[PDB]
Amino acid sequence: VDKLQQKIKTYKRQIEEAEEIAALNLAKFRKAQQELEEAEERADLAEQ
Amino acid sequence: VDKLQQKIKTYKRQIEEAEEIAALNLAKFRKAQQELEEAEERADLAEQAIAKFRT
């Protein structure tokens, strides 16, 4: 039970990094959606 | 052990959902940034066009 109790700890600290490497990778998708709108309002200023 | 051995199946099911969630979440940004590279050059060519056309 004890060497098994190490494993439940070492997964639980592994999934927390595993969600964060997902979470940080979500941020760039929010970044690209932000940079498109400042690019698009640059664009429609030019087309007129 | 009977209460723990179901949970090690549970967390391993979750981290096998986790990394695949990260995969598709990268797959959007890879699609997103590439068209933004196509789009941002449109603004820079327009910028040098109008500023030359300004005078």
Technique used:
cryo-EM
Question: Within a 10 A sphere around the Cβ of A20, how many other Cβ atoms?
Answer: 11
B22 closest CA partner among A43, A17, A48, A44: A17
Q: Structure tokens of B6?
A: 């179901």
**Stated resolution in angstroms:** 4.2
Distance CA B21, CA B26 (A): 9
Distance CA A21, CA B37 (A): 24
DSSP of A17-39: HHHHHHHHHHHHHHHHHHHHHHH
> Which string of b and e fits A25-45 if b means at least 16 CB within 10 Å?
beebbeebeeebeebeebeee
Q: What helix, strand, coil percent values describe chain A, rounded to 5?
A: 95, 0, 5
Q: Where are the alpha helices (DSSP H) in chain B?
A: 5-53
Name the residue of chain A whose CA is nearest to B8's CA: A8
Distance CA A41, CA A45 (A): 6
B11 closest CA partner among A18, A28, A24, A2: A18
**How distant is the alpha carbon of residue A33 from its chain centre?**
13
Chain A residues touching B32 at Cβ < 8 A: 29, 32-33, 36
Distance CA A41, CA B33 (A): 17
Residue type, B32: A
Task: Give the gyration radius of chain A's Cα atoms.
Answer: 21
Whether B8 and A8 have beta carbons less than 8 Å apart is answered as yes
Name the residue of chain A whose CA is nearest to B39's CA: A39
Q: Among partner residues A22, A33, A46, which is closest to B22 by beta-carbon distance?
A: A22
